[PDB]
Ligand binder design. Structure first.
Ligand SMILES: CCCCCCCCCC(=O)N(CCO)C[C@@H](O)[C@@H](O)[C@@H](O)[C@@H](O)CO
Ligand SMILES: CCCCCCCCCC(=O)N(CCO)C[C@@H](O)[C@@H](O)[C@@H](O)[C@@H](O)CO
Ligand SMILES: CCCCCCCCCC(=O)N(CCO)C[C@@H](O)[C@@H](O)[C@@H](O)[C@@H](O)CO
Ligand SMILES: CCCCCCCCCC(=O)N(CCO)C[C@@H](O)[C@@H](O)[C@@H](O)[C@@H](O)CO
Ligand code: NA
Ligand code: NA
Ligand code: NA
Lengths: 93, 93, 93, 93
């Protein structure tokens, strides 16, 4: 069902944005200072846009293991979207 | 039908490019000064290319709510393209 | 058939790389000075990687209509790949 | 089978990361100094993120044929991922 996936992604996004605001908020305030800043940056990361050279590398220079957070977040959001976008398309057929 | 979608995308792109030229044109002339400049930049945004670090963040530094314009535009264009490209391929089957 | 598409793309890529070496080679030598340089840069453009902020905008500052070359090239290569990648996957099923 | 592909991708990624640490590690330590650094950078390359303007062009300025390594790696990982993500979804049908 498509309703489960959009909700699943919404929940994952709030937990990750809390976790990111918590973990990296003090050291990276512009990208992770708020829940709302983090939601936006995690969205950018989901679009694969400058995620490594722009966000994750400058973070790993302070939090060398930040990659265990962001890579799986990516693999998770990316997968869920394809199952989601295909979900709506196929469901009407 | 596939014909509905390509027209839909053209309409959405002109409304958004008018809206973007109107909203951000005076403060960001190189990216939004004309209809034609905006068409091109909104296209870039559709390709997810440097959209956050290159366009939307520098805009939000002047228009902090610019994210309510660009994120939905993205989620919309990205969705319609996948439905369109799949649409034609299946249409021949 | 999948054999037609891989060849079609190969031909389009040589014509476009000749045309790009011809049109922009003198004014943008590092990206378009050779056939082989252009093949590589057009490939980057096909991957949507920094294509606008990195290549096409600096070019349009010299060739303002360069967008009539690169945007359709993009829409063409992007479409042909999806039909191609789906082609092999479905063909074995 | 979907199990074959995830293992295939892991093997390809370790061979490429050994090869990249070996080939480019001494001249590009931040991106290729370790197995683990290379795993991360090769992953970034798989996401098409700043791979040309950020990694491959600065490398080709030292290793002009670095393109015979990275382009095929890309065409390979990108292909296997699409076959993998589609693989699981269809597998449940
Ligand atoms: C996926 C959900 C994305 C929500 C983005 C919300 C971003 C946001 O609220 N801000 C961006 C913070 O960068 C705060 C600004 O609205 C200020 O006005
Ligand atoms: C779906 C829309 C796809 C793109 C629509 C066309 C973009 C036209 C851009 C444009 O006209 N200019 C570049 C603006 O940067 C101005 C000049 O180069 C010429 O007039
Ligand atoms: C799609 C085909 C891509 C072919 C890329 C070939 C790139 C190339 O031959 N060079 C890159 C030029 O940037 C020249 C270098 O091999 C020098 O050694
Ligand atoms: C499919 C592979 C997906 C990625 C594999 C893991 C990447 C691990 C990167 C890594 O270990 N480091 C970052 C290197 O930049 C070094 C430290 O942060 C820790 O040890
Ligand atoms: Na992309
Ligand atoms: Na990108
Ligand atoms: Na990018």
């Amino acid at each position: 069902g498509v309703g489960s996936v959009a909700a699943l992604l919404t929940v994952v996004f709030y937990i990750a944005a809390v976790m990111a605001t918590n973990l990296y908020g003090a050291t990276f305030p512009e990208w992770f200072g708020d829940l709302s800043k983090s939601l936006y940056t995690l969205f950018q990361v989901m679009t694969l846009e400058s995620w490594s050279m722009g966000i994750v590398r400058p973070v790993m220079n302070v939090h060398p293991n930040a990659w265990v957070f962001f890579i799986p977040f990516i693999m998770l959001t990316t997968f869920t979207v394809l199952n989601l976008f295909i979900g709506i398309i196929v469901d009407a057929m």
